[model samples]
Target: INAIRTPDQRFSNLDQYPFSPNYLDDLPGYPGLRAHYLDEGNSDAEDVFLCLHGEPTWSYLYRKMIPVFAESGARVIAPDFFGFGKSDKPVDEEDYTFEFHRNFLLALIERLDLRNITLVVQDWGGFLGLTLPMADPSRFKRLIIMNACLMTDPVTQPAFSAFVTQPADGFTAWKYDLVTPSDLRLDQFMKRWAPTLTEAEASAYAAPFPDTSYQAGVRKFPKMVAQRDQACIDISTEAISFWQNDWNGQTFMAIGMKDKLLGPDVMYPMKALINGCPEPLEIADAGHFVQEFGEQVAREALKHFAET
Candidate 1:
């Protein structure tokens, strides 16, 4: 399968994203495909913070939190899913499957040999990543979730239909993201949906891809969330049990109330799924990318997760 590598210069000297790239190209299954991550803080520490990001975004999302973790003597691991960050972007949108990305993430955890970990996730971060620890629950000790969901329900086409129709500019805007995506479209979308975002910040979000081919992963992620293989869907049912009853871990939740797609309507249900997860720190002004406003969340999550 052919994949595209965004020029390293694309990521240079952004508003934030100061950490250097750490690549792992030789994971057993995916060869010649490099994945990028930001590893910071004390490696010898007892706990490692594993941060994950979602669609149209990359590990840069966690910039605010990594320093917080590093300064306080905690290890932080932030990985960009294959297509979105400094990771390799496969040109075949068809190949961006739940299994493809999910397994890659699992491989990353094993390769890094991370344990006594804390998972901090949001948006697609939790969509695909929240279920990961069931593969090795003993490795993780805590979870910090924001604006995410895990489900096995049989959803109708209308939910996805909404994606194309919501932009409602017909194909002018819809096709812009779907068929031939460019940074301009991304900049436009972020500014429209995530309005509080500044020009530089929006550009940072759009920085990963120079063209549509690079976006095969980004383009496909929305549908893949629902098209999760039966294996994953089935496991979601079990994950409910793990989260609801079978696990022992501290949990923190933050909600970006402005995110209509995965807002209170979406998260309150997940809150029910996670046993003992307390009321979320609702960000009334923030949207789906809660990390844009994640400073308080990282601060609070560390405080609780670090507690004896």
Candidate 2:
């Protein structure tokens, strides 16, 4: 894969996100598409968990939870989206769209032949990852969702601004190259959205977008959302239908009450959207990045899923 790979030094000395990266540079359906992911724990295990991260965040977001999940005698693989973490960066903002990113993930899953997956996702990961099960319902066995929604437009939510899409407009409202994201940006977002983020944790989140090119995917994702005609949202709607009626898999939810906009209240409708999803594990003070408190959550999830 001729795709870009960020400097290894960019990720050095991260807080608790110490797992070495595992890359699959030759992913099929994505010619020369270099992808970055972490394959931790027993590679031969069953009921493998596929952890997906959202915009701006990477596999680093799950640092705390990965070890916990890995120790459960299951394989855990967490991949950074095409433009985040150690993955390749597409220079043009136009290179990103809901379909493009989702297809990359689909290709990875097929290539890896990941089976019996417990899909763990949040934020952009939630809406995009949530829709994947319907592609091969049998491939997944459980779900662990946090601060996210179906993202069907015209029913706009506060988490994302309106899908102001226009490839001709260079893909976003703001001048893309003009925005320089330093460590301060990451620190502030975490401090407000998830106050428990240690200084090192915030710095880790800031690792990906060291330059203008690396920020393309981050900027384009919001714009890629629906403007009343998004195919991904349509697919997500179908996935919701499948889960509400046809899906027989176990489900677990976590609510970070202190989340700026995606509080437990926003998560209520999802309970109805997913059939038989038991009451969520509510953390009174935790916020949007619920995985920051993941050590406990993972333990609870395995306990529930392990229950015969």
Candidate 3:
């Protein structure tokens, strides 16, 4: 459990991130490591929006969307997955497996006794978060999916296989950029991938990692996407069944049309997988970090949920 906590000063004066920090140091399976999360809105509200962010980004990614969800009179919870934000970052790349991050989420939900959740996801968020409801279905209620795909068994899900093979945005090249660079400047990286971000917003993405040493989790994530290990595949395969058959909850999907990674081609297939999922709200200007246009997405999602 050797880890490093980013200095508090690193997060000071972040753009539009006024959330108060909440931490959990003692959780089952994870010893001596503290996880950081934002608990906004009515703490005792009947509904909870459990927003999960993706690789190399933390709860800050949801800053634009959080208030919209919170203002709807729902409690909003966004957690920094171990290494990404103000949370404790484990030094070893080997320690960050799919199960490691997945288990942290399972433990966090149980610790807070969160129920009636509206799972908001993008990037690595959807990769892992989409598989979660199958484990404990009743705790979940709705889904707000953006620019993400399931890492399923390619043999069974040919679309996923084609996704890996096809060079839409050249995912292989994208993976190369992350893995090959030992010193990944997240600000510059975010600027390239999510072109709409302002300079301050781009810099906010890099706040967690001051040096390469703090980037073990960041480095491990992209590799995990292409690796598609057995456990991840099996769990994801089961989740497909759960969504298509067992799930009766509401779902709103948004596609970042400009996203090279998991864009319309990927999201359209994802929409068809869920039993009750509807046509997506396509953002013409947004890219991989769809949450950058989150205020509109969140508002529309809430309107969709309210009307239905």
The TM-score values for the models, in the order shown, are 0.89, 0.87, 0.97
| Cα-based lDDT at residue 141, candidate 1 | 88
What lDDT would each prediction earn against the true structure? 0.78, 0.75, 0.88
- Over 147-182, each residue of candidate 3 has an lDDT whose tens digit, in order, gives 888888767776665655567465666677677887
- After superposition of all CA atoms, the RMSD between model 2 and the true structure is 4.8
Write candidate 2's Cα lDDT for 1-308 as tens digits: 22465787887777777688788866655676678999999999987889999856899888888998999999999999988888887777776777777788898899899999999988879878888888888899999988776766445343233223333332242223223443225544555456677787888777776655566777666555534245866876677788788888899999887664455656877777888899998988787788888888888988988884
Identify the superior model by lDDT, candidate 1 or candidate 3.
3
Candidate 1: regions farther than 4 A off: 155-184, 226-228, 306-308
Evaluated at residue 221, the lDDT of candidate 1 is 72
lDDT tens string, model 1, 123-154?
A: 66786778788889999888899888774644
Off by over 4 Å in 3: none
Worst 10 residues of 1 by lDDT: 156-165
TM-score of 1: 0.89
Residue pairs with backbone atoms closer than 3 Å in model 2 (clashes): none
Best by TM-score: 3
